[PDB]
Amino acid sequence: TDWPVYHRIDGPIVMIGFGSIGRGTLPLIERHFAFDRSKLVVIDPSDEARKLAEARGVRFIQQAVTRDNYRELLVPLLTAGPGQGFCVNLSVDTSSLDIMELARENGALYIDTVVQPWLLKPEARSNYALRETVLAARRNKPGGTTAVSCCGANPGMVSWFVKQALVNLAADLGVTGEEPTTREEWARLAMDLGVKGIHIAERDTQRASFPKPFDVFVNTWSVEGFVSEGLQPAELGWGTFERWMPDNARGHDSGCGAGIYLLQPGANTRVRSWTPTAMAQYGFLVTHNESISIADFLTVRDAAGQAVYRPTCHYAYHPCNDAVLSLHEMFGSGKRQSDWRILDETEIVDGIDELGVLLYGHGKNAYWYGSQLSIEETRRIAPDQNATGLQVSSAVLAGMVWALENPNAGIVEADDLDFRRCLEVQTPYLGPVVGVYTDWTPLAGRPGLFPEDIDTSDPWQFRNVLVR
Amino acid sequence: DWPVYHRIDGPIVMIGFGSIGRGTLPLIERHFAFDRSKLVVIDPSDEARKLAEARGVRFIQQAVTRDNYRELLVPLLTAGPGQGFCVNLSVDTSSLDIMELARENGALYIDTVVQPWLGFLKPEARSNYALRETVLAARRNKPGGTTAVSCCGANPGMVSWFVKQALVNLAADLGVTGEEPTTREEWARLAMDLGVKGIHIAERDTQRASFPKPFDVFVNTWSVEGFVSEGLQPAELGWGTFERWMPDNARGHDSGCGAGIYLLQPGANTRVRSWTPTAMAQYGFLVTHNESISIADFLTVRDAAGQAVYRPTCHYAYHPCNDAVLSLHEMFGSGKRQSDWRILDETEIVDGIDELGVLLYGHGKNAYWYGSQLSIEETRRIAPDQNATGLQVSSAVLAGMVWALENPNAGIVEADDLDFRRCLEVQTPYLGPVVGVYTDWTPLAGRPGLFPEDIDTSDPWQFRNVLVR
Ligand SMILES: NC(=O)c1ccc[n+]([C@@H]2O[C@H](COP(=O)([O-])OP(=O)(O)OC[C@H]3O[C@@H](n4cnc5c(N)ncnc54)[C@H](O)[C@@H]3O)[C@@H](O)[C@H]2O)c1
Ligand SMILES: NC(=O)c1ccc[n+]([C@@H]2O[C@H](COP(=O)([O-])OP(=O)(O)OC[C@H]3O[C@@H](n4cnc5c(N)ncnc54)[C@H](O)[C@@H]3O)[C@@H](O)[C@H]2O)c1
């Protein structure tokens, strides 16, 4: 009845970054893998991180990993032996692709939760473009040591939820038969079910024991990371059903073809969305890797290679109340707050991180599938983190298990992993995982007091979702 | 001790006993001498009844409606022996109809808002410009007569007196010579000569509650029903002659004073870039307010032909308390009102201020904020039964009442028509720090930035730059 130990790691474990996610992932690595304790080392420039690592009894190197030092630092650490090591990258300000390629070159497994560069026109700031660098790297060097790109809660877990949700939608219609095996089969299942689009539909209700301080940005995970992505252009996977886009929307000349972006910051762009606890709510259209990767994954092309079916996919994020206030403060002031803080589990009085996928446009209108993990449950089952952190760290755990079980798979996205195996590892840490149908649409209660440019023939059009 | 300004020798009829009525009644008892059993409070709610009974004040548990207001109020207003005073602090009642009833029965009248009877509409008809035009027409139809003070709370109300004092201060600091204005035409000419392109009613409420905001509860420091109703009205502003651009969904008015436009979107979901001393640069919401129109109208200069050659832009730039910001996000994101609401009591507020002032911009010193920084701690020391928001309003009602008793045959008047020095002399003891602050901030601070924006770089204070689009 104790915790399962999934695998032995026969080489160094190098954790890059020991912020909110690193702190939550370390205890799960220790819990679920067998290895000599001295094999693990944490790298992070922060004094705060150093003091926590010392209290946890783990090796700690207080250094920022940079383009200038990453080869001389990471190659010896990852190749120390006797066997294959694992690079666990949970940092800000480091090049995911460069570290990934270095790990592969040296036979070390690799996982991260984001594609980002080393510490510029808007299209270059896009997660579409960054994802294209990873796809190109895979084409240049197929196969080889497994490296898992963007395997956190979102991007990451939500790709597995999309697959489970598609299977459930079919079953709820009385459609029986083997589930898809190939990418094209998954894409055709979405097409055949009439899925028009998908929101990554999230509502964080975690509340702090102190009121939000003036001129302090407050969040339940990285403030630096959230602000960085929130200032990037709004970004979405763009569905074939869409008949309207804003005047300030732009596409891409190259790549998989699945994305557009808007010439405005994602964290100041609102969309109409829905989760089970929030019901109808505003989300922020913050750019995310999975907005592109899920739309790409579910694309059906004709013989000529043109996409004839693709779902819309984007984030619709309602963060914790203090983060909502922090965004209002930041954008209203035109500048970042002087200080910031990430809520510790000891500072959260109650709440959940409700994180799921909202598939819409099919015969049952809309279906939300995801996790309702509470802070109370989090504290009972995993230390050193809040409910936001545990969804992410447990997804990293699942990706690490998959990579150790499938060590010769090359560069892979969350959409490439065995979703059933990953969810089997992750689900002890997700609290209630539920599927909920709703009849809500973005046109509920509309038109109202004022004229609006809506498309009443198709309630889920982005024209109706975007707050204008 | 506290000054007793005057005796009131007739009935005092208070319509509405919510957050503002509860804050105003103690000031009335404190600052006027009157037969105490001559005060009557009318409110439909049981909560109001219990509070009035606890004070031993006559109470009538009725909702004033178009169907009953004549039969209900006339006996109360004319009960004698002397001139009565109708103090209207309610939601859901016709300001104009009750004002006219008071006037034709010789009773003084004051309120803090122009609003219609609760309905059992074209966007233009929902505008405060239209509502104010019904009051202006009433004045033209019955000049002079018994005084009725329209829209004399904190804003609208006190901020009109702040605008006059700020113009005086700017004149001194910019070396503009001339005697203090004493007529509307002289005030308007002073604003023109100072180069005041526009005015924000620039407010930041930092009052914080001892409990976190509950899900599906709208929280505010004053009327939730009243704030939501005004926040769903069209965004609305006095429209200055310097403006070179208006949004595609802006509209004007065929008739009336000519000072206003409105936008075909709700004010409480419309953001503007603004500034207060404690907030520094912030978003405010462009909630419609009577003074947006009245201040712009008051400061209009016309040529001989009657065409406006100068007028300041004027509008609200409201940053309410944090729990109200979250309540608006919740309400607009859900597309419907929350199932419950609450107004923060002073006992529930841990700290904070209601920073309420006027931001005059476009002149030689860029921008100037003048107003009140009243804290909840100071409020509790000097006045009972209210928070810092309520006390700024209730003290303004007091000031207007003192002015009306000293000027009881002035006809229908707005806060812009009162003697601002006398009103501020009555109100200032309840306003805490009242300060003027210059800033170099403009709406183009930091702009253009990461993304292309439709800005006017020739003039930072253009509405094109202020409006969040
Ligand atoms: N996919 C997901 O679900 C998901 C969820 C949360 C976060 N993330 C990603 O992970 C990132 C980290 O999140 P977090 O909440 O732990 O952030 P955090 O801000 O709490 O921690 C970041 C850590 O990185 C360290 N760091 C900074 N520069 C470094 C360098 N050059 N080398 C090594 N370490 C460095 C900092 O000292 C800090 O301790 C986020 O910015 C985000 O991109 C992904
Ligand atoms: N000018 C200003 O600065 C300013 C400031 C605050 C409020 N106001 C105005 O004053 C109004 C009242 O403010 P509040 O905070 O006291 O509101 P509130 O919601 O606390 O109280 C309103 C009261 O009116 C009563 N009421 C409802 N229908 C009625 C009717 N038909 N007849 C008589 N009473 C009735 C309610 O029972 C309630 O007690 C607001 O809606 C707003 O328009 C103006």
Numbering used by the authors:
A (entry chain B): 2 to 120, 128 to 476
B (entry chain A): 3 to 122, 128 to 476
Q: What does the primary publication say about this deposited structure?
A:
Bacterial HSS is mostly found in α-proteobacteria and in some β- and γ-proteobacteria, including pathogenic strains such as Legionella pneumophila, Brucella spp. and various P. aeruginosa strains, including PA7 and PA14. It catalyzes the conversion of two molecules of putrescine (PUT; 1,4-diaminobutane) into one molecule of sym-homospermidine [HSP; bis(4-aminobutyl)amine] as the main reaction along with several side reactions. Bacterial HSS is NAD+-dependent, active at neutral to basic pH with an optimum at pH ∼8.8, and shows increased activity in the presence of 50 mM potassium ion. BvHSS forms a dimer, with each subunit containing a boot-shaped substrate-binding pocket between an NAD(P)-binding Rossmann-like domain and an HSS-like domain.
An ‘ionic slide’ (residues Asp94 and Glu117) was proposed to lead positively charged amine substrates from the entrance to the binding pocket into the active site. The activity of these BvHSS variants in relation to wild-type BvHSS correlated to the negative electrostatic potential of the exchanged residue in the order D94N (61%) > D94K (52%) >>> E117Q (1.5%) > E117K (inactive). The deeper lying residue Glu117 consistently had far more influence on the activity than Asp94 at the pore opening. Due to a lack of interpretable electron density, large parts of the ‘track-and-trace’ loops are missing in the BvHSS variant E117Q (residues 123–127 are missing in chain A and residues 121–127 in chain B). The shifted side chain of Gln117 is thereby moved away from the entrance tunnel and does not cause steric occlusion. In addition, the electron-density distribution of the NAD+ molecule was interpreted as alternative ribose conformers of the nicotinamide riboside moiety. While the ribose moiety in the wild-type structure is exclusively present as a C2′-endo conformer, both C2′-endo and C3′-endo conformers seem to be present in the BvHSS variant E117Q. However, the extent of the above-described structural deviations is rather small and should not exert significant effects on the activity of the variant. Instead, the drastically reduced activity of the BvHSS variant E117Q is assumed to be caused by the lack of negative charge at position 117.
